[PDB]
Each structure stands twice: as structure tokens, then as C-alpha cells.
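Schema walkthrough. Field components (list of strings):
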Amino acid sequence: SLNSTGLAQAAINGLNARFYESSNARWSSDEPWWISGVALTMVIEYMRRSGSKEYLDQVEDVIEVQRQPLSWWPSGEGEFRADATDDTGWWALAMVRMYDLTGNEDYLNISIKDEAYMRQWWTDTECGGGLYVDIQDLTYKNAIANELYLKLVASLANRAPNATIYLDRAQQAWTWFLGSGMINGVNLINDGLARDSNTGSCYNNRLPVWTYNQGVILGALVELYHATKDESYLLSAQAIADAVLSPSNGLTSSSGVLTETCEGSDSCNQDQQVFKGVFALNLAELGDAVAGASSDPDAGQDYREYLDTNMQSMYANDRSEIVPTLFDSSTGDLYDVSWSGPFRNATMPKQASAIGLYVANI
Ligand code: NA
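Field assembly_structure (string):
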């Protein structure tokens, strides 16, 4: 009795009615730029899974304007090449999705430029591999920038005409990620790596376990499986997803709802507000690959049931409708950060995460 497609469209319409800036071809200029890339990913993936083309013109407008040389990083020369490798990775993966939706080689070319850009800050001389997130400072090799890069090369290994070195780079990047220690003893991924002051060796910095660091890695392993047909990549991804679903690890509540570690203290900032939807979209990618890899009709119900359970909870406890007026007839739905808690306000990162959950159920 729940239409995930219609609810995703209502959430996207609510995102546009409250946060889209037509004069800037961007959502919420007061919010981080990379979250506009996540929002573009959610709108693109909605069209891919639902077969709709309703926001195609808007998405093209955002791409055309935001691919220009960024005013805060002109040396990147545009094409989403920014002052941080994870900022670039979010838009790069959005262009991979835009290529999947349209088949236009232009978007694939952007992702190829982004891969070569991010690779510039991969070094073997610290932590035996991995890339830095802070382009200007080069002091932090974290989980999200390396998960985004890994999913990028793995995606290009399935789509780019020169798929050989992208597969070799993806296999080498996953080998480094697995051996880095960021995947801890319960198969969850901490924020990044610290460096020994004397030996130069790198180790898990034990910073918080964020949901989107348990998600992007799943899509990377799904793409690695599609490029190799090796179910070992799916089994590693399933181990990470199963750790998130286990309530003993604190990411899944007693009611079975995905819960960011900052929701209890009500301290989720603009970045953390978008994390949950990114995991949900990537979990749906894993559930699809798992169901298609085995003849069992029971392949991956837990992931589908999890996404469905979280969807109903967000529908009932986290929803709020915009008030239509005599002048503005825009209709849709707004959402807060907690998928079980009350609706206090709606922000663009909160809304983008919302769309990701509905799209993950399409
Ligand atoms: Na190490």
C-alpha cells in the first residue's frame, strides 16, 4: 500500500520547491556544494529506476552550470574538479549514473577526467596507497574519498572504452582498502587513517562509524563483481551490510531503523544529515546484484525488507507536507534527519537523504 515511486517524486518536488535555485542551477547555495551532487544523484537514480524523465531538463541545467570552473578552485579547470577529492568523487559518480540513464558519452567523459584528477593525489609513500581528501594540505587519507574513488574506477571498468587499467586500479584500490585497517573487527568502517608519529605506519583512527562510509563501499564492490563475475566481492559487501543491519552495532535501532550516530545528541551537521540516504541507495544496488547472482528467489530479502522497514518508518514519523497557497501550487513532502524521530525542520541534506531511501525502494 506504499508507492515508493510516487513518494520519491513528492520528495523530489519538495526538494525543488524549498531548496532549488533556478538562477544558480543549484540546490541551496548556503549548503555544501558536494551535497548538490548527491541530490543530483538521487534525482538521476529516481529516473533510472522509475523510467521517468520528468526532471531531465533540470538535471541537464545543473550539470551545465556546475561543470564550469569553480570560483573557489579555478585550477581544477571545471568538470567538477574541486579542492577536495571527495567533492569531485560525488559529482563523478553522479555522471556515471547520468551516463547509465542517457547513454550520452559526454557524461562518461566527465567521469574519466574526474578519475584522472583524483588519481593525482594517490600516493604509495604513505599508508602504502590511498588518496588524500584535502588537496591543499594532504594530511588525511579517509574512508569516504577512497570509497568514492574505488567505486569510480570500478564503474569505469564496466563502461569506459579503456576498461583494462580501470579494472587493475579498482582491484589494487580494493586490496589497499582491505589492508588499510579502516574495516574494523565488526566489519564496519571508521572515518579514516591516522599516521604514526615515529614509524610512519598508518592505522584506523577510531573516529565515528558513519553510514555513508558503509554504503559507497557496497556499490564499489557491486561494480567490482560486475567487472569480474567474482562473487567474493559480493560476499565482502554482504558482510559490511549485515554488520549495519545488526542492532548490536548501534547503526540499526531496536525498531529496525537506520540511525546516524549523531541523532541521539541531535548534533547531526549539514554533512551528516545526508549520510543515511547514500547508504540506502547503495544497499539497494547490493540487493539487486545479490538477487541476480543466485537462482534463489529468497536472495537478498533482508536488504529489501530493511529498506522497506525504514521506508514505512520515515513515511509515518518523519514526513511533513508543504502548505499550498493561492499563488504557489507546488506539492510534495519534506523530511527531517531522523527516520524515526519527529519532524522538526527540513534541510536540503535531510531532504536528499530522504529521496535516496524512496529511490532505494523503487
Ligand atoms: Na598499515
